[PDB]
């Protein structure tokens, strides 16, 4: 039974390399992470920093979450990210995404012991 | 000097077939990849996925290695593989193998900068 922490890592961490290198990064990554398996997940962000650096966000700027909870944290620094968004013509089972690389702060919800990210709330 | 990363590709990649389909695959491959030179390597697994799909596993689910180290990673999806296991009546230099094809999650050990597969740990 996947933990919320593990889910975060499967959906949002890609510490492989510092940049999405290819226009097809999202198509490959979305599939390699199980996010085109039953339906196309429409929108997803991958963060290209070390796990340690992303976990450290949980001791940075405390902010409200979109849902009203107060266990969210904004990274003090910007991070290398890739935004994956399904195209307007994408239709399961041939999921198609446009890849956009950015450097932006991330906002995560943190929970548990160890106290780690369990939800990606936004990039800013 | 063969790198560890190139050694893994020699010993464990074979992105040319979708499977095995052929009882003689391991007899041919184990020899062809230099795995029967000094002895009959007793067990070995080949992966029938792209090189980028196997290298992407080093950013996938972190799991303990069988030897207790921490640098092993399990694929989120299943991958086409072929296990090769030396038969009971195999005698070097005439190494003989049973060929079994499967679709299993793979577990690899990753090392280096760039962080790449260097050992095939297990399939599950």
A119 counts as catalytic: yes
Long-range CB contact pairs, B91-98, < 8 A, 24+: B92/B36, B92/B39, B92/B40, B93/B36, B95/B27, B95/B30, B95/B31, B95/B36, B95/B40, B95/B41, B96/B27, B96/B40, B97/B26, B97/B27, B97/B30, B98/B26
Q: CB-based contact (8 Å) between A13 and chain B?
A: yes
Tokens 């921490």 label which residue?
B70
The pair of structure tokens assigned to A51 is 């796990």
Active-site residue, from A58, A82, A119, A120 = A119
Q: How was this structure determined?
A: X-ray
DSSP reduced 3-state for B66: coil
- In a 10 Å sphere around its CB, with 0-12 CB exposed, 13-18 middle and 19+ buried, how is residue B71 labelled? middle
CATH number, domain A1-124, options 3.10.130.10, 3.40.710.10, 3.40.50.620, 2.60.120.380? 3.10.130.10
The pair of structure tokens assigned to B67 is 């030897």
Contact (CB<8Å) B61/A9: yes
Contact (CB<8Å) B52/A15: no
| CA neighbours closer than 13 Å in the CB half-sphere of residue A109 | 18
DSSP reduced 3-state for A81: strand
The pair of structure tokens assigned to A64 is 């409200």
Closest partner residue to B56 among A10, A13, A32, by Cβ? A32
From A17's Cα to the closest Cα of chain B, the distance in A is 8
With CA atoms as reference, report the closest residue to B25 among B97, B76, B90.
Answer: B97
| Extents of the domains making up chain B | 1-124
The pair of structure tokens assigned to A104 is 């932006």
The pair of structure tokens assigned to B2 is 């063969």
């Amino acid at each position: 039974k996947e933990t919320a922490a593990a889910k975060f890592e499967r959906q949002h961490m890609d510490s492989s390399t510092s940049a999405a290198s290819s226009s097809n990064y999202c198509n490959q990554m979305m599939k390699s992470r199980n996010l085109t398996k039953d339906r196309c997940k429409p929108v997803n962000t991958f963060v290209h920093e070390s796990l340690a650096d992303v976990q450290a966000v949980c001791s940075q700027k405390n902010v409200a979450c979109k849902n009203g909870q107060t266990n969210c944290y904004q990274s003090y620094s910007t991070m290398s990210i890739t935004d994956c968004r399904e195209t307007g013509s994408s239709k399961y089972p041939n999921c198609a995404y446009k890849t956009t690389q950015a450097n932006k702060h991330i906002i995560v919800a943190c929970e548990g012991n160890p106290y780690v990210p369990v939800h990606f709330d936004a990039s800013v």
